[PDB]
Structure formats: C-alpha cells, structure tokens
Amino acid sequence: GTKHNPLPKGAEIHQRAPMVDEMVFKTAIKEPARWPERFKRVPHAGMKTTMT
C-alpha cells in the first residue's frame, strides 16, 4: 500500500478509565456522574443487633 503508515500503530490514543465494549454498549457515558443522595443513618439505632 502506502510506503508510510498514515496512522502509525504506536501513535494511538487509547480510552483510559473503565474500558467498555462498543459492540453491545452503543452509547457512551460522559462520567462526571451524579451519585444518588445518601440518607444519613440514625446515629443510635443504625447498626445495633439486639444481641449486641
């Protein structure tokens, strides 16, 4: 073909953070993401088993 590679194999920019398949997951996620709200637990009856 061409004598010089138009896009050399070493000069590629891979994605970065979590790699995802584009074959089954067509839409991409722009991910600074909103996590849901966290109800603060009740401070004295949150995790206290009746045994303890």
């Binding site: 996620i29 966290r38 109800f39 009740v42 009856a45 949150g46 206290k48 088993t49």
Partner: protein, 431 residues
C-alpha cells in the same frame, strides 16, 4: 448461602428492578462503581444473597435483564448503579414485543428464551445454596406478559423446589395506557397461577393513589412508584439479608401465607409513608406503623381489603422495637375487626421482626396480605376481556402467530375458576 436470582422482564420490570438495585446497593453500602464502602460488617456478612464477589471490592448483582427492544438497555444504563450489572446479563433482542402476548411467548420470545435460560443457569449453578428466583415484570405488555411468563415456565420446570416469586404489575381499567391489556393479563395469569409460588400483584392505579394521597407529590412520575415497589421488595427479604429477633425468609413466607396452591396472589404494603407537610405531626411508633399498614389506602393493589376477607397476613417489621408491642399491635387488629378475617384459620398473622432498619429510617414495616379481594382485579380484567373477545376484536394479531382462540377460552375459564375458588374460600364457614 440462601441465594436469590433476580430477573427483570420488560420495560416496567427493568425500571422497577433498576430502582430495586439502587435501593439494595444503598442498603448494603455498594457504590455506583460497584465497590463496597460501607460502615459495618452487617452489610457484608449477607452480601452474597444478591451479589457476586469479584476482584477487589467489586460486587456484581445476580440479575438477568430481558427485554425485546434495545432502547430499554439504554434506559437502564442511563441510571445510577447502571454500570454495576455484568454485560453478559444484558440479554436483549433486536425487534420489539409490540404489546403482543403471542409475540412475547410464541414467535420471538422463543428465540430469546434459550439465551436467557443459559444466563440464568450461569447465575444459578454458581450458588452453593440457591434459594429462589424473583421476577419483576408487568402484565399488559408483551415481554412481561409473554417472555416473562415463558421464563416463569422454563425456570419452574427446571427448578422444582426453589421459591418462585413474581411482583407482577397487573393492569388497571383507570390507568389503561394499552387496549390489549385484558388479553395480555388474561393470557399471563394462567402461567402465574400454575408455575409460581408467590405473586405480589402490584398495579399502577394503587401506586398512583399511594404516591398521590398519603405522599401528596404534585408530580408523582414513575421513579417514586418504582421506589415504593423497590422498598417492598427489600422489606420482603430484610430478614434474609439481616439479623433479627424473628426470622422469616421466602420459604417461611410461602408456608405461612399459602393455604392452598392456587391461592398465592398477595397484596403488598410498606408503611413509614407520610407527606413532608404531615411529616412533623408523627409519633414514630409501632402502633402507628401497624395502623398505617392496615389502613385500606396504602395497599399497592387497588383491591379493597374491606370488600374481602384476609386469609393470611404477614408483617415484616424492621428496626429496634419490642416483641410485646409487635404482638399486641398485630393481635388487636384481629380482635377488633375480626369480621374481615377468615374464621377457619385462627391467629392468621405471622410477624417477622428484623433489627437493621433501612438506611436513613428508624423503623419500617412491610405488609403482605393474602386477602380474597384479588378477585376484584381478576373480575375487572375478565369483564374487560369478555367485551373484546365477544366480537373478536384485536384477535387476528394474536391468532396470526400460531395461537388459537381456544387458548383465550382456557385463559378466561381458568381465571374464572380462580375467582370462584377465592369466593368459595372466603364464604366457607368454620363448620
């Protein structure tokens, strides 16, 4: 041990289970990235009921996502906790159910059922002590009414003794939203009554009324409805997932709520529910929880328990309370209005008190009732079915796919048999 395989069929089941996984991961401390960042070891000791351990702190839910259209896959990946699911469990066909029970069951659901059974066998043979299969779906559609009941069938006659429960968003005359809802519901209730073990029977009308009247909520939308349903699904298994004074898992619930095998159609209810205007007028007590459970407006089914008789009642309380107060508050609600309970089942109330309330709540309580008022929903579906089937309206769509009208005849007749069975078992005397 005591593993549960979750399955969500159709758009409604997918959205409801997505809210369910948000609620469950919030309760267990799982981050939206999938890692565990909780505060106590009680969130980690029973994590294997719904989750699989991966490398690091990753937890993958044991859920199978089925729908016949690819748009639901985008709609369920658009949510928070959308990347926690394994991509191998995203089993989606490239077509669309078209609100057709025959499409979902006989033509294109048959091409997807082998792959869904393969991935459920994947999620089932990895469990050492697999307990049951839960399915969330909606009767009235094409995948929940069709593919969902087909999945119920193959999972049943592959696993005999495992506890099957379906949550079953049944249609309603007032919400409507679909003309062929009577056909889909009538064709699906036949597979519901023969191949399941606990059917929970939610509908959108009672969900709107709950989100509408005791919560105000000027814009009710669908997320709040799925939140209520998800809270109920968490409350029916909090005794399985957390230590408590009285433990009752799904097997004990099926023992204590099913007198006869074709009587497993329950009505749910979850009752620390008040509006934010009424929020500061509360006492926050076990009698308040029990009373707002047994109030005949917080039922997630439009059936009125006053127009019926309670065969069995299950109450799963959650938090730090006293057994004396719990037993007194579920004994006086038999002694006062004993006329709404069956005489031939004495003390027909089973209580299960856990010790870890949901995150942010002091006390919560889940109500399950096997009342004989489910015949109201079934009779409304039948009276809407027998108007269409008399003139055979919209029948060519179903019968051009190999289906016969004798199948509709069986669906209507066996549903009438279920209605008559419920009426006989509510009008039967002691002796």
């Amino acid at each position: 041990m005591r593993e549960i395989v979750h399955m969500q069929a159709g758009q409604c089941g997918n959205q409801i289970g997505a809210k369910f996984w948000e609620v469950i991961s919030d309760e267990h401390g799982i981050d939206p990235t999938g890692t565990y960042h909780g505060d106590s070891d009680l969130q980690l000791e029973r994590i294997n009921v719904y989750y699989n351990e991966a490398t690091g702190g990753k937890y993958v839910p044991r859920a199978v996502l089925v729908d016949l259209e690819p748009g639901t896959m985008d709609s369920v990946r658009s949510g928070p906790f959308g990347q926690i699911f394994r991509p191998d469990n995203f089993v989606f066909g490239q077509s669309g159910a078209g609100n057709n029970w025959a499409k979902g069951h006989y033509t294109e659901g048959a091409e997807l059922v082998d792959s869904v059974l393969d991935v459920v066998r994947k999620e089932a043979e990895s469990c050492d002590c697999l307990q049951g299969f839960q399915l969330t779906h909606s009767l009235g559609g094409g995948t929940g009414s069709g593919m969902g009941t087909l999945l119920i069938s193959k999972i049943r006659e592959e696993y005999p003794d495992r506890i099957m429960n379906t949550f079953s968003v049944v249609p309603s005359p007032k919400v409507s939203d679909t003309v062929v809802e009577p056909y889909n519901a009538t064709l699906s209730v036949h597979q519901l009554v023969e191949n399941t073990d606990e059917t929970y029977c939610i509908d959108n009308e009672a969900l709107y009324d709950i989100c509408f009247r005791t919560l105000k909520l000027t814009t009710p939308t669908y997320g709040d409805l799925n939140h209520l349903v998800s809270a109920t699904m968490s409350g029916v298994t909090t005794c399985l997932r957390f230590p408590g004074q009285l433990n009752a898992d799904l097997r004990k619930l099926a023992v204590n709520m099913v007198p006869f095998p074709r009587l497993h159609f329950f009505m749910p209810g979850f009752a620390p529910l008040t509006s934010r205007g009424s929020q500061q007028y509360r006492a926050l007590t076990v009698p308040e929880l029990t009373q707002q459970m047994f109030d005949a407006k917080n039922m997630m089914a439009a059936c009125d328990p006053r127009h019926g008789r309670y065969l069995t009642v299950a109450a799963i309380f959650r938090g730090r309370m006293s057994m004396k107060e719990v037993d007194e508050q579920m004994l006086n609600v038999q002694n006062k209005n004993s006329s709404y309970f069956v005489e031939w089942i004495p003390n027909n109330v089973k209580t299960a008190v856990c010790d870890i309330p949901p995150r942010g709540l002091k006390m919560s309580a889940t109500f399950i009732g096997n009342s004989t008022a489910i015949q109201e929903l079934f009779k409304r579906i039948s009276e809407q079915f027998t108007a269409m089937f008399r003139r055979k309206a919209f029948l060519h769509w179903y019968t051009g796919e190999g289906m016969d009208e004798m199948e509709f005849t069986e669906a209507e007749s066996n549903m009438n048999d279920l209605v008559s069975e419920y009426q006989q078992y509510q009008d039967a005397t002691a002796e």
